[PDB]
PDB file of C-alpha atoms and ligand atoms in Angstrom:
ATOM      1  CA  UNK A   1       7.272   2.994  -6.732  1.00 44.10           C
ATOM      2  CA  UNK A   2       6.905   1.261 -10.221  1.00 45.57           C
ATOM      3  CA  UNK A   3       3.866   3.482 -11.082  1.00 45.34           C
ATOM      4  CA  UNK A   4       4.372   6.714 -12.387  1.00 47.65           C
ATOM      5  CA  UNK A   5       1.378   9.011 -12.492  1.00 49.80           C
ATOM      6  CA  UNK A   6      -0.980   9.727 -15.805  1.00 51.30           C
ATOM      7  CA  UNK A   7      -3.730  11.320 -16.042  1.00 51.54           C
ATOM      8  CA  UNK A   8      -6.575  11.044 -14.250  1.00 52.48           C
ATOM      9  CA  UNK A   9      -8.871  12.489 -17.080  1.00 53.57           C
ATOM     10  CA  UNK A  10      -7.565   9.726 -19.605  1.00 55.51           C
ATOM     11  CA  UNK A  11      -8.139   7.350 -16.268  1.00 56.02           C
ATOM     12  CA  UNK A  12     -11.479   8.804 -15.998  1.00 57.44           C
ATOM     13  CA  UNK A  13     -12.598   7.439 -19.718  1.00 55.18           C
ATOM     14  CA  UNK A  14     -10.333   3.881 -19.306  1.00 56.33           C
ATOM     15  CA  UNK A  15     -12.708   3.114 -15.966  1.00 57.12           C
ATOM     16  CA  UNK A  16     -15.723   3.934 -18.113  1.00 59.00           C
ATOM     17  CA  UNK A  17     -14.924   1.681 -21.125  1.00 56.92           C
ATOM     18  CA  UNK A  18     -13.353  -1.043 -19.557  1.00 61.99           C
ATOM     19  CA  UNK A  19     -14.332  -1.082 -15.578  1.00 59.88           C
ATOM     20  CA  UNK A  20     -18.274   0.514 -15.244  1.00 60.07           C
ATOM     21  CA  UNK A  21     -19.481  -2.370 -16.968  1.00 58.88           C
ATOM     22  CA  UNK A  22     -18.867  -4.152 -13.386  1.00 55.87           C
ATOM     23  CA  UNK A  23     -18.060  -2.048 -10.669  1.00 57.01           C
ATOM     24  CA  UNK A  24     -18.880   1.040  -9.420  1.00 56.63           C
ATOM     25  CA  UNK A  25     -16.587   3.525  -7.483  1.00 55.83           C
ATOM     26  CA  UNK A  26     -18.488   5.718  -5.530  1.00 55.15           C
ATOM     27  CA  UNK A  27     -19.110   5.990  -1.427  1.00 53.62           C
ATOM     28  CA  UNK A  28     -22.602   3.790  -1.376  1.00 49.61           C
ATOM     29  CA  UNK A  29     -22.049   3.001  -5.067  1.00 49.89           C
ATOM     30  CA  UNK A  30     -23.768  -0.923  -5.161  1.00 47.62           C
ATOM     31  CA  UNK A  31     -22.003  -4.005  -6.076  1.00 46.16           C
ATOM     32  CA  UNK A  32     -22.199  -5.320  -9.130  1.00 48.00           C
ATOM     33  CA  UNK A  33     -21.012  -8.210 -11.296  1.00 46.76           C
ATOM     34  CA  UNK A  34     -18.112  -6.959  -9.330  1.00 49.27           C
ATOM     35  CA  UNK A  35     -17.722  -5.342  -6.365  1.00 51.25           C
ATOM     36  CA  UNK A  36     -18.259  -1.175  -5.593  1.00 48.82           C
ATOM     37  CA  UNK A  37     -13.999  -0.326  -5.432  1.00 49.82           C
ATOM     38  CA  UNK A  38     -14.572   2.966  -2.748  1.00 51.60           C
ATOM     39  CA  UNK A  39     -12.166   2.670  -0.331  1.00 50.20           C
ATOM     40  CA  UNK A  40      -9.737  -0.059  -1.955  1.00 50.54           C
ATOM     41  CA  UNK A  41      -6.372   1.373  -1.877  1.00 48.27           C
ATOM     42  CA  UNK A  42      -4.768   0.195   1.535  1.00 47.83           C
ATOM     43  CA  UNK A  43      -7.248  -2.674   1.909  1.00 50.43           C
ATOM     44  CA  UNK A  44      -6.857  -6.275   1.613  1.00 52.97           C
ATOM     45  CA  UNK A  45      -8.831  -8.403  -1.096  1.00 51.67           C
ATOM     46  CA  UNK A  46     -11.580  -9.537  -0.804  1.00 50.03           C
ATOM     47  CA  UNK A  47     -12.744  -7.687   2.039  1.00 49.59           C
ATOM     48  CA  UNK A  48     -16.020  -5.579   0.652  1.00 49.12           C
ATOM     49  CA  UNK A  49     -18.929  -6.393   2.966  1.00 49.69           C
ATOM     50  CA  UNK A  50     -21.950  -8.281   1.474  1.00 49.23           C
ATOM     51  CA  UNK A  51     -20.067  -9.087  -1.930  1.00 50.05           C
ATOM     52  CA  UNK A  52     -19.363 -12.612  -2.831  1.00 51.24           C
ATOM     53  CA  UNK A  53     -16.180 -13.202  -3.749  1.00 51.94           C
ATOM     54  CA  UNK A  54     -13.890 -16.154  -4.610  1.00 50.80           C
ATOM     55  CA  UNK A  55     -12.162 -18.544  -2.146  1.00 52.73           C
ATOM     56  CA  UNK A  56      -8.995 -17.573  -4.591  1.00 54.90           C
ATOM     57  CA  UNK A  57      -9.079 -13.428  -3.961  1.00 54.45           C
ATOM     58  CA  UNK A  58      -9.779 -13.951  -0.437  1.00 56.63           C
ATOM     59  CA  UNK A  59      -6.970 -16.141   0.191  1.00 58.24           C
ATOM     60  CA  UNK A  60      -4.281 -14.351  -2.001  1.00 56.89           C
ATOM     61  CA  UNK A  61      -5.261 -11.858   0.302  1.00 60.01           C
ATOM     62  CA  UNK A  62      -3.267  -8.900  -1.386  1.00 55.04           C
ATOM     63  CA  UNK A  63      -2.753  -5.577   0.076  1.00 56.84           C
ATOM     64  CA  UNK A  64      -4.039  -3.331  -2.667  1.00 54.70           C
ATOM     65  CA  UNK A  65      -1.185  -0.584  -3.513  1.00 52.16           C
ATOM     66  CA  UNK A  66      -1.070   1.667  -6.683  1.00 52.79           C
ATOM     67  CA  UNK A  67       1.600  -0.945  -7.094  1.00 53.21           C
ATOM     68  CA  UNK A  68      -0.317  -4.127  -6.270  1.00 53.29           C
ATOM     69  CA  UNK A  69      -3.029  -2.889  -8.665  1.00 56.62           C
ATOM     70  CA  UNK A  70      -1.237  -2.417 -11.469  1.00 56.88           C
ATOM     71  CA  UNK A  71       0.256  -6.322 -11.662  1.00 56.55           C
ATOM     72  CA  UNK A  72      -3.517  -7.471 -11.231  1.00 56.22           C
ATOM     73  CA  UNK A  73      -4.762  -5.037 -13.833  1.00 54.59           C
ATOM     74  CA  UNK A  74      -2.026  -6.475 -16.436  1.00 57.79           C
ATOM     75  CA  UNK A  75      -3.534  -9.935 -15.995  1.00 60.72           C
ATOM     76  CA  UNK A  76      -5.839 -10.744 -13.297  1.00 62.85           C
ATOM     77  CA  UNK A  77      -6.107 -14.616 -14.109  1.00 62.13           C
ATOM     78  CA  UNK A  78      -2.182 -14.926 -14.054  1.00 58.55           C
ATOM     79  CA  UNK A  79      -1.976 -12.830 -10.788  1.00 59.65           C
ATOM     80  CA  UNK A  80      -4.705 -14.336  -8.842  1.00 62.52           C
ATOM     81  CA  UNK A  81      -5.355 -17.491 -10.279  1.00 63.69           C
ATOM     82  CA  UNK A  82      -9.201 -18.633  -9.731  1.00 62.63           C
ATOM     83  CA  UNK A  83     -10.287 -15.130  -9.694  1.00 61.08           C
ATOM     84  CA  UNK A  84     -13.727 -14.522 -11.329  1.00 61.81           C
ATOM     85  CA  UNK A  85     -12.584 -10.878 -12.732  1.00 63.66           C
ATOM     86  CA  UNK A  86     -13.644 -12.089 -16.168  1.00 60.49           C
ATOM     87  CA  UNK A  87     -11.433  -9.199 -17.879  1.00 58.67           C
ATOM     88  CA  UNK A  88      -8.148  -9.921 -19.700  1.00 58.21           C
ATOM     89  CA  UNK A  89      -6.146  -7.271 -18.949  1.00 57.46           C
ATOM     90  CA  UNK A  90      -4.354  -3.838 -19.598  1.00 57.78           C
ATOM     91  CA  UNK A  91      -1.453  -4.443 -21.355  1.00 57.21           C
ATOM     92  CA  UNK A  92      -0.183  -1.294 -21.491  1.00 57.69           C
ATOM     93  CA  UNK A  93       1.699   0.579 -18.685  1.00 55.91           C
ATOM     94  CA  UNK A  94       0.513   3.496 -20.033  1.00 54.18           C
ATOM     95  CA  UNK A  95      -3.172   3.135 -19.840  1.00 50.98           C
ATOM     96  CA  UNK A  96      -2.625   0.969 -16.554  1.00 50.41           C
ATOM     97  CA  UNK A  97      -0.639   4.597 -14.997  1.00 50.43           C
ATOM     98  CA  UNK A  98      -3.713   6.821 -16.488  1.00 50.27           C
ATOM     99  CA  UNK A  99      -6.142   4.336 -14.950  1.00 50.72           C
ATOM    100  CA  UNK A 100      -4.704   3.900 -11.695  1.00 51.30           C
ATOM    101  CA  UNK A 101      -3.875   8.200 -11.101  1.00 51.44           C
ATOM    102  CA  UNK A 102      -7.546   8.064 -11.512  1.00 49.20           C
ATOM    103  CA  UNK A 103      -9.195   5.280  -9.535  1.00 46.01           C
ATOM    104  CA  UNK A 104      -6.279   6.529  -6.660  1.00 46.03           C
ATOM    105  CA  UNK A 105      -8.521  10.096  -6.670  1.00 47.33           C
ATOM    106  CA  UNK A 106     -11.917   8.594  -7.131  1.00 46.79           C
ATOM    107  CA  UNK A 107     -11.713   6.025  -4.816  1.00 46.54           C
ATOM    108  CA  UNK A 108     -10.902   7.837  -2.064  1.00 45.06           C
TER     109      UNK A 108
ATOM    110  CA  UNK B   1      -0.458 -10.475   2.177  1.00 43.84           C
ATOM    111  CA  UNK B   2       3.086 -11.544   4.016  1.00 45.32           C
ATOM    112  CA  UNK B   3       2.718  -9.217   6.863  1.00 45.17           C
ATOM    113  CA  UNK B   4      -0.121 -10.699   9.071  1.00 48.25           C
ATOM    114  CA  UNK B   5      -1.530  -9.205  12.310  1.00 49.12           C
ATOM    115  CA  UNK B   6       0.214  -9.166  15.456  1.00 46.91           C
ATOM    116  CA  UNK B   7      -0.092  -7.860  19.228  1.00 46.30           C
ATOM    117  CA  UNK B   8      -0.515  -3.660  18.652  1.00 48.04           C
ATOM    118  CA  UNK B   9       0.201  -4.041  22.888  1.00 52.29           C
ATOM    119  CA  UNK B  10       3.334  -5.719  22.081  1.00 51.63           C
ATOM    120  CA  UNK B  11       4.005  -3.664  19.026  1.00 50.76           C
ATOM    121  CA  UNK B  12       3.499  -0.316  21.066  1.00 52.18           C
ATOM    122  CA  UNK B  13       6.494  -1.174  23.595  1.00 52.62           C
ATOM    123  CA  UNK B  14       8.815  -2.433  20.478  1.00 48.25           C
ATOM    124  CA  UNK B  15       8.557   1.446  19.166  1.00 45.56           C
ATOM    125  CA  UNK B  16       9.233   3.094  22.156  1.00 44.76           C
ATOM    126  CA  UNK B  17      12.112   0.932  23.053  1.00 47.21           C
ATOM    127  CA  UNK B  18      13.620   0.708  19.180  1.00 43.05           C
ATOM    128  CA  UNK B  19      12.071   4.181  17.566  1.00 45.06           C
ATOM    129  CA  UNK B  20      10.901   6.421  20.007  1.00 47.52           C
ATOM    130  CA  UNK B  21      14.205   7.854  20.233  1.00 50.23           C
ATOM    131  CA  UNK B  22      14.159   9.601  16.539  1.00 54.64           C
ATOM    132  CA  UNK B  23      10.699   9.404  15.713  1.00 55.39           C
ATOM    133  CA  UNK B  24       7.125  10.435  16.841  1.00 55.73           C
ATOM    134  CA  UNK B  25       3.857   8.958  15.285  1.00 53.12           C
ATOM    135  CA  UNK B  26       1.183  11.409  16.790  1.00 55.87           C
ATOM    136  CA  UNK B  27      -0.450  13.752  14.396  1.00 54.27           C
ATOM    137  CA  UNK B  28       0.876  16.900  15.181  1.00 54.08           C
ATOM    138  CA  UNK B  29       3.590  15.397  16.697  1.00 53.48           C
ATOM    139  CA  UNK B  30       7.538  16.927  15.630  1.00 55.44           C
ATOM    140  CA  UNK B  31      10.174  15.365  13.520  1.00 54.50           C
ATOM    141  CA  UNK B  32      13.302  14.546  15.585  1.00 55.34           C
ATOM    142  CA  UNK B  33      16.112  12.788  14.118  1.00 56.13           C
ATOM    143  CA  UNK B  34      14.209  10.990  11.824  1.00 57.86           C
ATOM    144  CA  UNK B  35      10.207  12.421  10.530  1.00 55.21           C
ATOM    145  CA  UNK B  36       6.938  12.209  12.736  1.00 57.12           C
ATOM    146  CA  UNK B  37       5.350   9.164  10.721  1.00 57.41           C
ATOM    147  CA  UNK B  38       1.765  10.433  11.197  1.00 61.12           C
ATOM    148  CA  UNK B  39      -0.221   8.992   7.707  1.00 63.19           C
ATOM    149  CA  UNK B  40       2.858   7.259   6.379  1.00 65.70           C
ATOM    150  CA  UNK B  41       0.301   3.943   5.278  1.00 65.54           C
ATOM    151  CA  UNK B  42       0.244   4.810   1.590  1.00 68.65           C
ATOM    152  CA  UNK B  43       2.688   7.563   0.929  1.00 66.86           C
ATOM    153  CA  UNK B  44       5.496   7.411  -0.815  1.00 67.82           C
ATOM    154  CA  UNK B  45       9.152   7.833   1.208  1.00 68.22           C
ATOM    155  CA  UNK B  46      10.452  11.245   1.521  1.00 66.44           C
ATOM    156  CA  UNK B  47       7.458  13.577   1.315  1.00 69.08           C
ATOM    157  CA  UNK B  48       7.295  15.351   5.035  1.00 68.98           C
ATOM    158  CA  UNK B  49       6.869  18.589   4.783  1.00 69.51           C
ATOM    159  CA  UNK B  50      10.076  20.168   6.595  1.00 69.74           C
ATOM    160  CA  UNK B  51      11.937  17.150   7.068  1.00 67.84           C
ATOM    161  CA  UNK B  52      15.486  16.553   5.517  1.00 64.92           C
ATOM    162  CA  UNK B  53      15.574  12.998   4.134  1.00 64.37           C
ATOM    163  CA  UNK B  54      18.596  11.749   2.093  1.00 66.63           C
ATOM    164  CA  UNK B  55      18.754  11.798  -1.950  1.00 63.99           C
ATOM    165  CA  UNK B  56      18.530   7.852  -1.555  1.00 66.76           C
ATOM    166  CA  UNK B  57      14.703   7.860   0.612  1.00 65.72           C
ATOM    167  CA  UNK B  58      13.149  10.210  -2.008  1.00 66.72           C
ATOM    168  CA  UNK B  59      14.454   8.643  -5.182  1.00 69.74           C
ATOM    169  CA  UNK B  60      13.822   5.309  -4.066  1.00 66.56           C
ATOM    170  CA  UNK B  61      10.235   6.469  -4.022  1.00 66.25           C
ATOM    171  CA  UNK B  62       8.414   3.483  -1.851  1.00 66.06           C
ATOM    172  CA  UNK B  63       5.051   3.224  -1.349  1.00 63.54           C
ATOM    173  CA  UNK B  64       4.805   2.279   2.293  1.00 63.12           C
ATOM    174  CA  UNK B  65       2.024  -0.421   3.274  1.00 59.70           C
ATOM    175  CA  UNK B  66       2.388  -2.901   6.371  1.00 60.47           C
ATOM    176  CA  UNK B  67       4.407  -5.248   3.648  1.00 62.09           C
ATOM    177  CA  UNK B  68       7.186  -2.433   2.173  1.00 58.71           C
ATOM    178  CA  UNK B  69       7.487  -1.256   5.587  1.00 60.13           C
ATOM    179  CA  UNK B  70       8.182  -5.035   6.636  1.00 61.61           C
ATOM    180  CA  UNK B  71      10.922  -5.302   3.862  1.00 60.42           C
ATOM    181  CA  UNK B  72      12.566  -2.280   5.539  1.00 58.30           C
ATOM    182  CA  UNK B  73      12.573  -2.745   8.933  1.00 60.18           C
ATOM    183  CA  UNK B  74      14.732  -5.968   8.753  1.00 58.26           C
ATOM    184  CA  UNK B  75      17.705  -4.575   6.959  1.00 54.49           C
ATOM    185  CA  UNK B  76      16.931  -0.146   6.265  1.00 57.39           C
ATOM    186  CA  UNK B  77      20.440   0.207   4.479  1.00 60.07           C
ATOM    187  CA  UNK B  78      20.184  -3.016   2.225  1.00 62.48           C
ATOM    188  CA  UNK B  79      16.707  -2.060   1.059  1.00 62.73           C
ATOM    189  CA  UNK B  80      17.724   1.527   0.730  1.00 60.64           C
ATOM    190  CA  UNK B  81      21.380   1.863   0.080  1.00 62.94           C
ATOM    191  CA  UNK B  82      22.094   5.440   0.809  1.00 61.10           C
ATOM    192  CA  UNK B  83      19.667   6.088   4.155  1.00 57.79           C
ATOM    193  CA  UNK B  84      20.750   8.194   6.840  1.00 57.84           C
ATOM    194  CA  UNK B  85      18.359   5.613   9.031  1.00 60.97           C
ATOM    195  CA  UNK B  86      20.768   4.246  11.274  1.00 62.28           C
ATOM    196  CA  UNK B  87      18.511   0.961  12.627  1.00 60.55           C
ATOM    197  CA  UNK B  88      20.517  -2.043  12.118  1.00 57.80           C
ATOM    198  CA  UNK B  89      16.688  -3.433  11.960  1.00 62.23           C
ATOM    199  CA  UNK B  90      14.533  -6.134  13.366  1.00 61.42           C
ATOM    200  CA  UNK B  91      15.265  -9.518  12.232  1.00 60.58           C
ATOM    201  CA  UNK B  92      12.039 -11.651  13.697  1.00 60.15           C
ATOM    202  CA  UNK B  93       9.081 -11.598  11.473  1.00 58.16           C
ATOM    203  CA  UNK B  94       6.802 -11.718  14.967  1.00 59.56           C
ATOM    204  CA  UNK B  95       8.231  -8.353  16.108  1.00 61.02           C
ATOM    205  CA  UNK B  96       8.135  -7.166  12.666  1.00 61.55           C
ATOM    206  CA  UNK B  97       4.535  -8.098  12.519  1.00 58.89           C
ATOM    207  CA  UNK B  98       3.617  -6.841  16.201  1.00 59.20           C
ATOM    208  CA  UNK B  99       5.594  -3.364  14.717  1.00 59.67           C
ATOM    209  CA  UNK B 100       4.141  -2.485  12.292  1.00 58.97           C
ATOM    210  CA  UNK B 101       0.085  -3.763  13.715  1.00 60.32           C
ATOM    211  CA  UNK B 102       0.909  -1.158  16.076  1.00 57.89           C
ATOM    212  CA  UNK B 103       1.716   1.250  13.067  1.00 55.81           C
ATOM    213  CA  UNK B 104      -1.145   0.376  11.907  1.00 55.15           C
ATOM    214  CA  UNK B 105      -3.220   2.127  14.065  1.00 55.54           C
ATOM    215  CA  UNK B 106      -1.033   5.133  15.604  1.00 54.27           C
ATOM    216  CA  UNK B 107      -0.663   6.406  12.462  1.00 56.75           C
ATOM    217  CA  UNK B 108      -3.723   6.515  11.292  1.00 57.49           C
TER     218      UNK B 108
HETATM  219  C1  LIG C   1     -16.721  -7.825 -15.277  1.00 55.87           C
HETATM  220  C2  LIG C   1     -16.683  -8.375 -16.743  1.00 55.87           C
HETATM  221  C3  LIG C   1     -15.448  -7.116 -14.759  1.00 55.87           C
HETATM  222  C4  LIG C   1     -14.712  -6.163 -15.364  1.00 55.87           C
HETATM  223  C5  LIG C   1     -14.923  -5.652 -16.791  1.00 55.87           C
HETATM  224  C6  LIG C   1     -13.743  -5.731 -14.381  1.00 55.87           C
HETATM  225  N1  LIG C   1     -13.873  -6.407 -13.201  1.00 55.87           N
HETATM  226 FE1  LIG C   1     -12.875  -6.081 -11.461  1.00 55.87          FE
HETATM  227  N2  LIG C   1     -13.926  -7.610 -10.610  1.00 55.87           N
HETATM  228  C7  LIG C   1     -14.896  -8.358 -11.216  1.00 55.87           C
HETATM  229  C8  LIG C   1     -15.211  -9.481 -10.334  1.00 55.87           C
HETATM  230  C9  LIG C   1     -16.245 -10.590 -10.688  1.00 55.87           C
HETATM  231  C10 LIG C   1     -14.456  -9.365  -9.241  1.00 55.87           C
HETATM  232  C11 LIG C   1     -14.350 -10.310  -8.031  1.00 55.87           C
HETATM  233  C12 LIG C   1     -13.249 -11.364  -8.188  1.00 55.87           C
HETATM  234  C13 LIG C   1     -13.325 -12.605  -7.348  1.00 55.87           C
HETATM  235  O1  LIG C   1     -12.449 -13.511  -7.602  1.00 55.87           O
HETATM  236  O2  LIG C   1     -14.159 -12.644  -6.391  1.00 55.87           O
HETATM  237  C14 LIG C   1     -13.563  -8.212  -9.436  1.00 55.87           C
HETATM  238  C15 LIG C   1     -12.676  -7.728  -8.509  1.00 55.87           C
HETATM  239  C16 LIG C   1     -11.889  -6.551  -8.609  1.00 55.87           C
HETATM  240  C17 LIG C   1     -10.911  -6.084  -7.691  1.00 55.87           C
HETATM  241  C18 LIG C   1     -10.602  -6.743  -6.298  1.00 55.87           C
HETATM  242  C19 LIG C   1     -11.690  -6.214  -5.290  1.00 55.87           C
HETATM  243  C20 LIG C   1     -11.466  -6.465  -3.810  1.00 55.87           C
HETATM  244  O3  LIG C   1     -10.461  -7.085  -3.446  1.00 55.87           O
HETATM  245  O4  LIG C   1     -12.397  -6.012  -3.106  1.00 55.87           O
HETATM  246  C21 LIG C   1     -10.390  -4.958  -8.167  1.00 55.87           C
HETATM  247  C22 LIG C   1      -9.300  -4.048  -7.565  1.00 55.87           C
HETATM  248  C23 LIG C   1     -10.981  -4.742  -9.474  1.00 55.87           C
HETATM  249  N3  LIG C   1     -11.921  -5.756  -9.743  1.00 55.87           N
HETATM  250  C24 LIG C   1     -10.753  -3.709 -10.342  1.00 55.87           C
HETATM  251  C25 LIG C   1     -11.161  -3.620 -11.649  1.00 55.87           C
HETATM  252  C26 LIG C   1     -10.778  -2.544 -12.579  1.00 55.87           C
HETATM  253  C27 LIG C   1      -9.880  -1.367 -12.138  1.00 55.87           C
HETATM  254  C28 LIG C   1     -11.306  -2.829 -13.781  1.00 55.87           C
HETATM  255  C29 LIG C   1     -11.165  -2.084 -15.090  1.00 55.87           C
HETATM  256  C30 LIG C   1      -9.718  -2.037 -15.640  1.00 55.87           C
HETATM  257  C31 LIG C   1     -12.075  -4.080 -13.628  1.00 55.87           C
HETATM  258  N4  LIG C   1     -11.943  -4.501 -12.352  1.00 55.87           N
HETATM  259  C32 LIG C   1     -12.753  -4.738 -14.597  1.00 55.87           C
HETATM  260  C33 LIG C   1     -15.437  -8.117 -12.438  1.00 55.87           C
HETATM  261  C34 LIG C   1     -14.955  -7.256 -13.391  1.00 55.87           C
HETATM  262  C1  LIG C   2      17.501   7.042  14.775  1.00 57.99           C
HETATM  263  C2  LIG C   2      18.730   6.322  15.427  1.00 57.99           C
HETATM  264  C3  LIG C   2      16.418   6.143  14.135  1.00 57.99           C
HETATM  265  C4  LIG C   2      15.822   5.050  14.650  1.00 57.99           C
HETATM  266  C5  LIG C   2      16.194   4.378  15.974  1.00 57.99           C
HETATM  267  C6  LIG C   2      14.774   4.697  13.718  1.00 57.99           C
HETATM  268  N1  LIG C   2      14.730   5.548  12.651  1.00 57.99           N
HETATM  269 FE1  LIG C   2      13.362   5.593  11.148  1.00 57.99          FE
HETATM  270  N2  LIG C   2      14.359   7.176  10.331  1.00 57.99           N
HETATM  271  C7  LIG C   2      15.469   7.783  10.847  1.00 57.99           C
HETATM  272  C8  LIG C   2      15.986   8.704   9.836  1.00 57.99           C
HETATM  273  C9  LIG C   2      17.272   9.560  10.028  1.00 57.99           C
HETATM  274  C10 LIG C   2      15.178   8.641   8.777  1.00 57.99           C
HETATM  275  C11 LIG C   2      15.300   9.358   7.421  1.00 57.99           C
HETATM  276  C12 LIG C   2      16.067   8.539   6.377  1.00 57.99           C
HETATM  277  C13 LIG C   2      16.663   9.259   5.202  1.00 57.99           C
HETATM  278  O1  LIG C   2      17.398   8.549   4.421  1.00 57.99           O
HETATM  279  O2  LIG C   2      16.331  10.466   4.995  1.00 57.99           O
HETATM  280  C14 LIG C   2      14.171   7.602   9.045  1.00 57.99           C
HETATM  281  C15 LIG C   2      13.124   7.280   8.221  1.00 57.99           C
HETATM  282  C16 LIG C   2      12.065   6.375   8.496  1.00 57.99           C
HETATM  283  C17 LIG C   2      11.020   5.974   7.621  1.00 57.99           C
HETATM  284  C18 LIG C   2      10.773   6.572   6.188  1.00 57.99           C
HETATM  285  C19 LIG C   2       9.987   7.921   6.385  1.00 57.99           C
HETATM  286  C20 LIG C   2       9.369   8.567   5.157  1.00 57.99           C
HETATM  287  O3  LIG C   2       9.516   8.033   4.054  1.00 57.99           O
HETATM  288  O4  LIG C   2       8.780   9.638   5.430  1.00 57.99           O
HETATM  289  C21 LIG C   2      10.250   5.098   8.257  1.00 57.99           C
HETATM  290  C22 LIG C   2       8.986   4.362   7.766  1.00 57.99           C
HETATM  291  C23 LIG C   2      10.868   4.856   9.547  1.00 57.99           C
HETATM  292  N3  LIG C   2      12.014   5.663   9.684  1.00 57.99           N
HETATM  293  C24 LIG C   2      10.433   4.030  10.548  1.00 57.99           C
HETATM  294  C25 LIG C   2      11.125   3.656  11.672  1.00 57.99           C
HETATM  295  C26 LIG C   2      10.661   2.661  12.655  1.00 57.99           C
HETATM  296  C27 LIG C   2       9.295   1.954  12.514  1.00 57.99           C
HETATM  297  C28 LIG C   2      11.627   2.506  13.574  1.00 57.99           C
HETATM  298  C29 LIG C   2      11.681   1.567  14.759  1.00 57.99           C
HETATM  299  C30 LIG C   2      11.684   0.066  14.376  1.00 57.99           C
HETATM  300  C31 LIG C   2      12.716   3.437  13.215  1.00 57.99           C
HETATM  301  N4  LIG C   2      12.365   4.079  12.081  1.00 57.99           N
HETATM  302  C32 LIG C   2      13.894   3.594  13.863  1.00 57.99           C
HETATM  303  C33 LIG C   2      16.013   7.540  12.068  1.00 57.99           C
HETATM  304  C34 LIG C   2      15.722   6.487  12.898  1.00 57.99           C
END
């Protein structure tokens, strides 16, 4: 692909410090500001079941690939524009690989 | 996405009639001339166990969802100089889209 993988332990402490604060990841983890992320890779946006989301993120309709992820992830605003994902983005390949290797295992 | 839902009915009689003849999809089905494509949503190109794919499949290192897979189908040898896949692919979106809905699910 375009994503190389990192570690999931550095991915791990990324989710806590710059994800948790909205979204959980967990099978029957709630939603949140945002919504739980279990299950995500392979599915379209906006798709979680009793979440509210955005006309914008449903439309966009994005099929959510290590690949996909990491674009949004660099700037969600400038990849979905009208998306309510109120976080500004990981600049970094680096810590967007590490994040990703993670969310990949946890997610599943 | 840019891959949206077709007829899996449609789709079904499209792969026996332009795949069946080097591939399976059944789990626990065998690799022919090309690899049994049993789980292939989501994983990279070129990771079969068993199966001897060209330098150019594992290198090129896809991740396949329904919209990669799209890309691929049309033109094999333009997205992936090098292949051994000797398609000459399948030029209408609609059967593209039928394809891979039926993909989709067999796979799975
Ligand atoms: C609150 C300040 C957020 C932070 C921090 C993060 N996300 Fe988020 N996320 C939030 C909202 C409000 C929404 C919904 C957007 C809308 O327009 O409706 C999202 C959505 C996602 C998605 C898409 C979910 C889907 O399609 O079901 C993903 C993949 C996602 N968020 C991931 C994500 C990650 C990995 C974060 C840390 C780097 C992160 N978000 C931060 C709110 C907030
Ligand atoms: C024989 C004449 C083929 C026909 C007809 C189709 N495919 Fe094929 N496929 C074939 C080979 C020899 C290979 C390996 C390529 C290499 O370079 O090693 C492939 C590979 C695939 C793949 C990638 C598999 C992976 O990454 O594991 C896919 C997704 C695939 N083939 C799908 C596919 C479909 C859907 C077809 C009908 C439209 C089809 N192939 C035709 C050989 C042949």
């Amino acid at each position: 692909t375009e994503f190389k993988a990192g570690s999931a332990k550095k991915g791990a402490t990324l989710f806590k410090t710059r994800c948790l604060q909205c979204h959980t990841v967990e099978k029957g983890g709630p939603h949140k500001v945002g919504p739980n992320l279990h299950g995500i890779f392979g599915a379209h946006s906006g798709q979680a079941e009793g979440y509210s989301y955005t006309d914008a993120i449903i439309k966009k309709n994005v099929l959510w690939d290590e690949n996909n992820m990491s674009e949004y992830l660099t700037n969600p605003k400038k990849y979905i524009p009208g998306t309510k994902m109120a976080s500004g983005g990981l600049k970094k390949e680096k810590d967007r690989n590490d994040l990703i290797t993670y969310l990949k295992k946890a997610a599943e």
